[PDB]
Structures are given as C-alpha cells and as structure tokens.
Design a protein around this ligand. Structure first.
Ligand code: YLY
Ligand code: YLY
Lengths: 260, 260
C-alpha cells in the first residue's frame, strides 16, 4: 500500500527539483528513471558541460574581467602553512599527507604568499583570485563536503574598504543570480568576519584587513577578501536538497543520479 | 670575473625561453628582474589568465565541441580502486590518505565507473573526458611532477578503432600547435600502448580496448582512450627547460619566476 521509507529514499535519489499516489513504487521509479535518462541524453546531445567546471569558468571570467589575476597554486601544501595560519577544531579537519604535507583546507596561505611576491612586480592595488579543490574532514553531509571547491578573491593596497568588498560580493552574486544577505560574524583564524548568507546557509566568509596574522606572511598593507564554496553556490542555484548533488562525484552528474 | 655556478642558476631562474659577458652578475640580474617584472605587469594589465587554467579551458572546449561529455569526479579516491586497476612500482607512488583513501594517480578508475553507469542512459557511443589533478610520488623533477594535471578522454561502443584514436590525438595536438609522433609501446596496467612522443618526452599514453581489466569494472564493450599531462603540453608549447615552470606553483606564474 503506502511507500516504505527505503522506497521513498530511492525515489528522492531520482527526483529533480523541477519534477512535479496511489501509484505503486515500480511505476513511479520507472517514470523517474525515464526522466533522468532523458535529462542526461539532453545534456549529452546539447551542451555537454559539467556544472562544477562550467561554474568555475563563469566565475573565472567574472574576476578576470574585473581586473583580478587568475592563480593556480598547489593543492598539496606544507603542514607548516596550517600552523602559520594560526590553526592549532579546524585542525582535526586537516587531511595529512606524508610527514610534512597536507591537503589544503583553504586558499589563504598560498594567496598570502602570492600577495607578498607580486607586490614586488605589480602596481597597486594587487587583485588576485583562485578557484580550486579544498579538503576538510567533516562530521556532516547536508551542507558539508570533505572534498569541495573554493573561490577566494582578494585585493591588497588601495581601495581595500568594506564598501568595495561588499560591492564586489553584491555584483558577483547578482551576476550569478543567487539571493543573499551579508551579516557581521566572527571566526578563530580571521576576525571579525562578514558572512554572506543564503537563508541559513553560509555562502561565504569575508574579511576586511589588515589583521595581525598578516605579519607572519610578510604582509603590511590593507587588504580585503572572500572565500565562496562553489558547491554551495550550485546547491542554491539549482535548488538541490543535498549538497552531494553539486560535488565531484560518481553518484551524481549535474545533480542527476548516475545510478539508473 | 666569470659567473659562478650559483649565479648562473640564479640567472637561469630569471631567464625566459625568448630572451636573447663580460657584463657582471649584478647588472645581468638587474636586467632580467626588470624584464620579468614587465612580463607580469603585461599579463596583469591585459589578459590575466593562468596558463594551466587557460589550457584546461581550451582543451575542455575542444572535447565538448567534438561530442565528449565533461566529467568532474573525485580527486580523493578509495584505495580499492588502485588494486582494482591491477596496480600491486606505480604502487610506491600512491599518496595514501586516511586508512581507506588515496590521491588519484590517474583518471582511469573513475572514468571506468562513468562509462559503465552512463551506458544505461546514453546512446552509443559514449564519449567522455576529464581534466584534473593527479598525484604520484616521483624521484625525478625534469619531466616529472608529484602534483600534475591529466587530461583523459575516451570512447566506448562503436568507432573504437586505432584509426579514430590516432585521428583524435592528431586533431588535438595540431589544434594546440604541438609537434608529436605516435610510437607503439607497453605498460603494466594496460598493454600494448601507443605513446605520443615529443622528441624523448612522453605527452601521452593511449590504449585501444578491450583489455581483460575491463571485466573488473563491468565493461564488456570496445573502447579507446588517452591520457595527456597538461604541464608536459605547456612545457613543449612554451619551450620551458624545466616542467616546474608549468606546474601549480608559488615559484612560477605562467613560467615567470615569482621570486623577484
Ligand atoms: C587570501 C587573503 C589572504 C588570506 N586570506 C585572505 C582572503 O582573501 N580572505 C579571508 C577570507 C577567505 C575565507 C577562507 N580563509 C575560509 O576558509 O573561510 P571558510 O568560511 O572556512 O571557507 C569559505 C567557505 O567555503 C565553503 N566551504 C567551507 N567548507 C566547506 C565544506 N566542508 N563543504 C563545502 N563548502 C565548504 C563555504 O561556502 C564558504 O563559507
Ligand atoms: C578511461 C578509460 C578507462 C580506463 N582507462 C581508459 C582510457 O581512456 N585510457 C587508457 C590510457 C589513459 C592513460 C592513463 N591511465 C595513465 O595513467 O597513463 P600515464 O602514461 O601513466 O599518464 C598519462 C601521462 O600523464 C602525464 N604524467 C604522468 N605522470 C606525470 C608526472 N608525474 N608529472 C607530469 N606528468 C605526468 C604524461 O604526460 C602522460 O604521459
């Protein structure tokens, strides 16, 4: 008669945000299987782009067009960078590799190094961004991924104000068509942050520098910056119930179940 | 009088492929510093794209345009995938994470899974590609990186011939403007390979399936495929002497020293 919890989980795997009893499980599953097969057929026939790759390209274009230098820095980083970030909490979340390296939990340490290095070469202000993989061991799975993709943009020198920071965030999310509000918060590493919220979901943490951590990185200039999770952005944009639908995955492709 | 070996190493750091005694070290270094600062100034003023990101976008466009589905699969993969790949040599090169996961040394295991899964949804033949980070512990540094970027494209079903494989490789490298020759070789995992060579540098290993390893992955169809290192491609394209100039790096940006 009624659907079992397991059957309901199965159908929810196959259900897409835009799909609209007493039909049996077998027929409801058959219908959804058919719809999802067609969705993949249509991607494959027409656009062929992965949502995560595509979102990366669109964001890349956005920040390049606005004068930010595209960075591609190591994903595998020295463990010393974690301790020099003031992280000794987030520390139980570090995936260690060999005795000396770890998978980066954020883009900040490498970007600090780039800011200092490029200050010797580039005119004020220095505007840079990176998009790439980051890793944190996470107890949750609703809004948290162990393997995720962060965007971090930043500016150092002139014009490093809270206004300009907010303006960039605003232009950015309006460009992407993502609703948001900016609330003042704090964290252990940075501040004093600004959190960019979608309802109760954190899209970004942002900071207006300087902060005292800067000195450890040879930075003695005003700066502003923000990190965004690309999977969180996709989750909002596509109305995905679970963030796993927006991840690097063998179970979902563009939020469509691959288990068909 | 003459330059010391250390001074020569310093200048070679600052030397670009296109730059053309008895001038002292200080003046030669000063000149190169000036040229490299201007190179970064010109990137920053004009294009602002990272060579590795840009190469990824151009390759992405190439394979999308030719009917291949863009994949973004996990970088952190189960250790079981390594053993199911027939790897028990390359095994000392695996960067292990936790007791159960590793950093992927190749794209093949995840793409095998995608081929099988998508066969239930997509018409014959199934054409897919991924571009992303791969990791191998490496004794060398001339043509080898521990952290690199692989392109792997493949097709399964109809038209999985050596001719079509060679044709795609040929169209691809001619598109990129990279000189090559295709030699028959072999490896422990696959074959029987075709190696795509630039002089003595391996750009790619390629395979015409089926092979007996397929059965472990639920694959029972003809297939063809090739993996290319993006850093190797950049190394050839830009005439870089060391592959570290083409890597994710805090020491080089688009093959320009960041230590200025
Ligand atoms: C570069 C300069 C010099 C140093 N720092 C400067 C800067 O530009 N800005 C300071 C603020 C950058 C934010 C960054 N350090 C950071 O790690 O903040 P988090 O809030 O911890 O990470 C940003 C978050 O990425 C996403 N994210 C987080 N963990 C997950 C998860 N496990 N699953 C999926 N998504 C997640 C989440 O969407 C977004 O809130
Ligand atoms: C997906 C289907 C199902 C399974 N396999 C199929 C397929 O499409 N093709 C089989 C052939 C794919 C090749 C892949 N399995 C492989 O790992 O071959 P390798 O020769 O070991 O890696 C390809 C190499 O990537 C680059 N590369 C390697 N190690 C490094 C390094 N340490 N530093 C920098 N660059 C490097 C190098 O340019 C290029 O020769």
């Amino acid at each position: 008669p009624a659907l079992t919890k397991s059957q309901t989980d199965r159908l929810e795997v196959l259900l897409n945000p835009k799909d609209e009893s007493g039909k049996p499980f077998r027929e409801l599953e058959s219908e959804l299987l058919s719809r999802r097969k067609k969705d993949l057929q249509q991607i494959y026939a027409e656009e062929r782009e992965n949502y995560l790759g595509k979102l990366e390209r669109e964001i890349t274009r956005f920040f390049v067009d606005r004068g930010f230098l595209e960075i591609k820095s190591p994903i595998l980083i020295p463990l010393e960078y974690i301790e020099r970030m003031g992280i000794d909490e987030l520390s139980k979340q570090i995936f260690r590799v060999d005795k000396n390296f770890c998978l980066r939990p954020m883009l900040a340490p490498n970007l600090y190094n780039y800011l200092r290095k490029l200050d010797r070469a580039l005119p004020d202000p220095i505007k840079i961004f990176e998009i790439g993989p980051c890793y944190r061991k996470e107890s949750d799975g609703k809004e948290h991924l162990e393997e995720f993709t962060m965007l971090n943009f930043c500016q150092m020198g002139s014009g490093c104000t809270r206004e300009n920071l907010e303006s960039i965030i605003t232009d950015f999310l309006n460009h992407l068509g993502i609703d948001f509000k900016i609330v003042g918060d704090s964290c252990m590493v940075y501040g004093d942050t600004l959190d960019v919220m979608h309802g109760d979901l954190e899209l970004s943490s942002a900071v207006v520098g300087p902060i005292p951590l800067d000195r450890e990185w040879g930075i003695d200039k005003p700066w502003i910056g923000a990190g965004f999770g690309l999977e969180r952005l996709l989750k909002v944009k596509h109305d995905f119930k679970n963030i796993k639908r927006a991840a690097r995955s063998e179970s979902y492709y563009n939020g469509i179940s691959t288990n068909l």
